[PDB]
């Protein structure tokens, strides 16, 4: 057939480029960074109404100061999360401190290109890694299966990404509050989702310095959805 670690004539790794196509088929995930905190939100996308939606876990805690959202082949993310959690805890053991969000992201990205003929193929999932540390404050990173990671003020990944990113382009400014960011994630998720957005098929989360990483209750998100509907009807 052909090598798994083969370069294309354009200078790109075939397998890495193909895994990026799998990520485009995944459910939408959005992240927004502010001076008051970072917000993470995902589309759950249940395949059937009999599927209990609260069991869909696409937002995940890595440590108290670092959270993570996923999009693509979500099964592949489990070993990446396990590594991230281990790396975060191990660093605390070795250095008696929290690990920098960038350093955690770098550790996860080191796994990416460890494939050949090590694992048999790249990961088919992208991650939004959000957190806080004392040095660089509130941060949001986008970790790909290429081994590359970019920092972002705001970012969307998944099937409705390029439409959502264009919306984030206009809406984001450096003086956004946490409440404003929450509504903004809900607004953009509602825009790109196939089914109508509610508290059961969408999930919010945030990371603040005081309270740390928190996944929002369905009752708490429901109120923010109702608050969104009213403010859009206000003009």
């Amino acid at each position: 057939d052909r090598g798994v670690s083969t370069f294309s004539p354009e200078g790109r790794l075939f397998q890495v480029e193909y895994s990026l196509e799998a990520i485009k088929l995944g459910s939408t995930a959005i992240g927004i960074a502010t001076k008051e905190g970072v917000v993470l939100g995902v589309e759950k996308r249940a395949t059937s109404p009999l599927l209990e939606s609260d069991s869909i876990e696409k937002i995940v805690e890595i440590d108290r100061h670092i959270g993570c959202a996923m999009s693509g082949l979500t099964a592949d993310a489990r070993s990446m999360i396990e590594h991230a959690r281990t790396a975060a805890v191990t660093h605390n053991l070795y250095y008696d401190e929290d690990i920098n969000v960038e350093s955690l992201t770098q550790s996860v990205c080191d796994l990416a290109l460890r494939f050949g003929e090590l694992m048999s193929r790249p990961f088919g999932v992208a991650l939004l890694i959000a957190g806080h540390d004392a040095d660089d404050g509130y941060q949001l990173f986008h970790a790909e299966p290429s081994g590359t990671f970019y920092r972002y003020n705001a970012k969307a990944i998944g099937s409705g990404s390029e439409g959502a990113q264009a919306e984030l382009l206009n809406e984001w400014h450096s003086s956004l509050t946490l409440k404003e960011a929450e509504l903004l994630v809900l607004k953009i998720l509602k825009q790109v989702m196939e089914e109508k957005l509610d508290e059961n098929n969408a999930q919010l989360s945030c990371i603040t310095k005081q309270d740390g990483f928190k996944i929002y209750d369905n009752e708490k998100t429901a109120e923010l959805i109702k608050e969104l509907k009213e403010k859009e009807a206000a003009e």
């Binding site: 799998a22 485009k24 109404p49 599927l51 609260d54 099964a75 489990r78 003929e117 048999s120 193929r121």
Partner: protein, 240 residues
Amino acid sequence: GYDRALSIFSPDGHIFQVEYALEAVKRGTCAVGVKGKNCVVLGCERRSTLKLQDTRITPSKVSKIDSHVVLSFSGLNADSRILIEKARVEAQSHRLTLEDPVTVEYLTRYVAGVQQRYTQSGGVRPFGVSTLIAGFDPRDDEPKLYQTEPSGIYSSWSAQTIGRNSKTVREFLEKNYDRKEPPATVEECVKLTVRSLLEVVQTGAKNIEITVVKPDSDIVALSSEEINQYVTQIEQEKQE
């Protein structure tokens, strides 16, 4: 050692070996899972192409992983034994180290993890098996029902079916299963499970297997005559 990458991405972002493993599941005999208010029922299809079978000794479709958790499946029968064995070993290992039996969610997460590992490891093909894992957590009366598949994704279900003609029985369950009021009793839950299989099975003789799991390690398999009584009552009400 044999290191060949069998599960790989294609230009359109698909892993065909994982997708072809799902086709093996589509071929397998139908399996269904329904959870009531205080129970879970696992229904399984037995294809009647094989008679002169010895039903005493033939491998049963529903397997006990521990005294409080069961596992049924659709797909390759030989492959399922490997997952069942690993699951049984992990169940005893969990009891040994944590001094507490596995939760249904944990056992599912393990089996799903094994299935995923076989989709990005060299020299191996994915499991051609999807499982339904059901039971009750230790000292808990809330019913649990989970599904897994070759890719390694897993999730919880109020009711679910897998295997051949699963599209039809899922159609039945989606209109007949009410979340606000699930099957309150064992009778109601078994009846709904047998009804759902009767949409697909053919004859209601030795083609339907039923296994009821209740809280506190109370697991029993219904006999032919007991199931036959449900089959009789369903059709007599249908003649109207």
